[PDB]
Design a binder for this molecule. Structure first.
Ligand SMILES: NC(=O)C1=CN([C@@H]2O[C@H](COP(=O)(O)OP(=O)(O)OC[C@H]3O[C@@H](n4cnc5c(N)ncnc54)[C@H](OP(=O)(O)O)[C@@H]3O)[C@@H](O)[C@H]2O)C=CC1
Ligand SMILES: CN(Cc1cnc2nc(N)nc(N)c2n1)c1ccc(C(=O)N[C@@H](CCC(=O)O)C(=O)O)cc1
Length: 161
C-alpha cells in the first residue's frame, strides 16, 4: 500500500511543545480532516492523548507497547508489523505522527503531507529530518489567515518514486 506521513510543522521543524500543538489553528484541522477522511490513522499513544477522542470516519489505530491499553472506538497495535497486519488490504495509510511514530515508519514512507507554519514557536518535539534529494514535490498551496488562524501557513505534498 501507500504509506503517507501527515504532519504540521514550524519554520524550524517544531511539531509540539507540551504534549500538545504549540498553536491553535482550527482551519488547519480541516484540510487534515478532508485529506484523511475514509482512511486509517496511525498515531502514537502520546499523540492520541493529545487528541483525547476517536476522530470520526477513519480507523484510529494507536501505537503503544502497553499490553493493557484500550480505548473504545480505537484499535491498538503494539508493533509496526501489527499495524501492517491490521491494515491488511488497505490502499493508503496515514501516519498521523508523534515523532517516535514518524521514526518507526520512515523505511516504509511513500509520500508526505506537510503544512509549514512561517513562525517560530519554542516547542520541543520535532519532525525528523528526511531524504536529501529523492522526494519530488507535487503540490503547493497557501492556507487561510484570520483571527483564529493568525499565522501564515502553506500546504505541501511530496512523493518519492
Ligand atoms: N504538529 C503535528 O502535525 C503533530 C504534533 N504532534 C505532537 O508531538 C507530540 C507527540 O509526539 P511524541 O512525543 O514523539 O510521541 P508519539 O505521538 O510518537 O507517541 C509515542 C508513543 O508511541 C509508542 N511507541 C513508540 N515506539 C513504539 C514501538 N516501537 N512499539 C510500540 N509502541 C511504540 C509509545 O507508547 P507507550 O509509551 O504507551 O508504550 C510512545 O510513548 C505531542 O506534543 C503532539 O501534540 C504529534 C503529531 C502531529
Ligand atoms: C493534536 N492534534 C494532532 C494534529 C494536529 N494537526 C495536524 N496537522 C497536520 N498537518 N498533520 C497532523 N498529523 C496533525 N496532527 C489534533 C487535535 C485535534 C484534532 C481534531 O479534533 N481534528 C478534527 C477536526 C476539527 C474538530 O473536530 O474539532 C478531525 O477529526 O480531524 C486533530 C488533531
Amino acid at each position: 500500500m501507500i504509506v503517507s506521513f501527515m504532519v504540521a510543522m514550524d519554520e524550524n521543524r517544531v511539531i509540539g511543545k507540551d504534549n500538545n500543538l504549540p498553536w491553535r489553528l482550527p482551519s488547519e484541522l480541516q484540510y487534515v480532516k478532508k485529506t484523511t477522511m475514509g482512511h486509517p490513522l496511525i498515531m502514537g499513544r502520546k499523540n492520541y492523548e493529545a487528541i483525547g477522542r476517536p476522530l470520526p470516519g477513519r480507523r484510529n489505530i494507536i501505537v503503544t507497547r502497553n499490553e493493557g491499553y484500550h480505548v473504545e472506538g480505537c484499535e491498538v497495535a503494539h508493533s509496526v508489523e501489527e499495524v501492517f497486519e491490521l491494515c491488511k488490504n488497505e490502499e493508503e495509510i496515514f501516519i498521523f505522527g508523534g515523532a517516535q511514530i514518524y521514526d518507526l515508519f520512515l523505511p516504509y514512507v511513500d509520500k508526505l503531507y506537510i503544512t509549514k507554519i512561517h513562525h517560530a514557536f519554542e516547542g520541543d518535539t520535532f519532525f525528523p529530518e528526511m531524504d536529501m534529494t529523492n522526494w519530488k514535490e507535487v503540490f503547493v498551496e497557501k492556507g487561510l489567515t484570520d483571527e483564529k488562524n493568525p499565522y501564515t501557513y502553506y500546504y505541501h505534498v511530496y512523493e518519492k518514486q
